[PDB]
Amino acid sequence: SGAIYVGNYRVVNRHLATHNDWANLVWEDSSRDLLVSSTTAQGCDTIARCDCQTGVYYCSSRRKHYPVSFSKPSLIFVEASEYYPARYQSHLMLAVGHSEPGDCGGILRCQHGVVGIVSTGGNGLVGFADVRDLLWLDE
Ligand SMILES: COc1ccc(Cl)cc1OC(=O)N1CCC[C@H](C(N)=O)C1
Ligand SMILES: [Zn+2]
């Protein structure tokens, strides 16, 4: 679990969005595993606008943060799960690091701000849904 709170927006994994997220829907994209809902309170986070390929992520299944080197956002094949059929997920960045399904939502940050959230993983890999291209999150 986990979310980004920026301005009057809440960014979550689409597969973990709540009834309240869908009732306050701003934008969603199944191919990216992202959903953004509106909030009444002003949010705590800053979005990075950069090309960093290193950063630190939070891993809830270890209660720890880990440094990572990750690939640029790209189209990656993701196996079927209970949430989606087998498909290509876009804007996904992969790195070597521990993750389990419940780690989805953990934030990846660089020195500039929030880069994205955990969205996929397995066998010593962790994948992050990028949010740095969503320029409207800041206006
Ligand atoms: C961090 O996620 C995992 C980590 C390890 C393992 Cl073995 C499996 C993990 O589950 C996943 O990769 N997915 C399940 C939920 C939906 C995801 C998606 N974005 O399509 C894919
Ligand atoms: Zn950066």
Side-chain angles (χ1 to χ4, degrees):
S1 67
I4 305 164
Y5 292 94
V6 50
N8 290 292
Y9 297 125
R10 164 172 142 108
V11 188
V12 290
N13 297 88
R14 191 190 184 270
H15 75 276
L16 300 179
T18 68
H19 296 307
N20 184 72
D21 284 322
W22 279 103
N24 293 283
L25 179 64
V26 171
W27 167 84
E28 54 76 34
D29 186 337
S30 179
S31 74
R32 291 179 67 154
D33 186 44
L34 292 178
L35 180 148
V36 177
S37 61
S38 62
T39 66
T40 52
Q42 170 78 10
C44 60
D45 293 302
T46 284
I47 310 299
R49 303 295 183 192
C50 68
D51 61 356
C52 284
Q53 286 185 248
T54 63
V56 174
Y57 78 104
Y58 182 67
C59 176
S60 66
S61 64
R62 294 286 180 270
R63 287 210 197 93
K64 268 186 167 85
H65 295 260
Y66 291 108
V68 279
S69 290
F70 47 94
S71 63
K72 291 183 173 180
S74 73
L75 200 54
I76 296 185
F77 175 82
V78 178
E79 303 148 58
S81 67
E82 55 264 58
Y83 308 99
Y84 299 106
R87 75 207 211 286
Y88 288 91
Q89 179 162 318
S90 63
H91 299 263
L92 184 60
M93 297 176 298
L94 294 194
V96 178
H98 181 67
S99 70
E100 298 179 35
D103 287 323
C104 285
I107 282 175
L108 171 64
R109 276 184 169 262
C110 63
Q111 71 191 99
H112 306 109
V114 175
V115 172
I117 51 172
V118 176
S119 179
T120 72
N123 302 302
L125 295 162
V126 53
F128 308 97
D130 186 46
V131 299
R132 295 177 289 190
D133 64 315
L134 302 174
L135 313 182
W136 53 266
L137 286 175
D138 278 321
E139 59 204 27

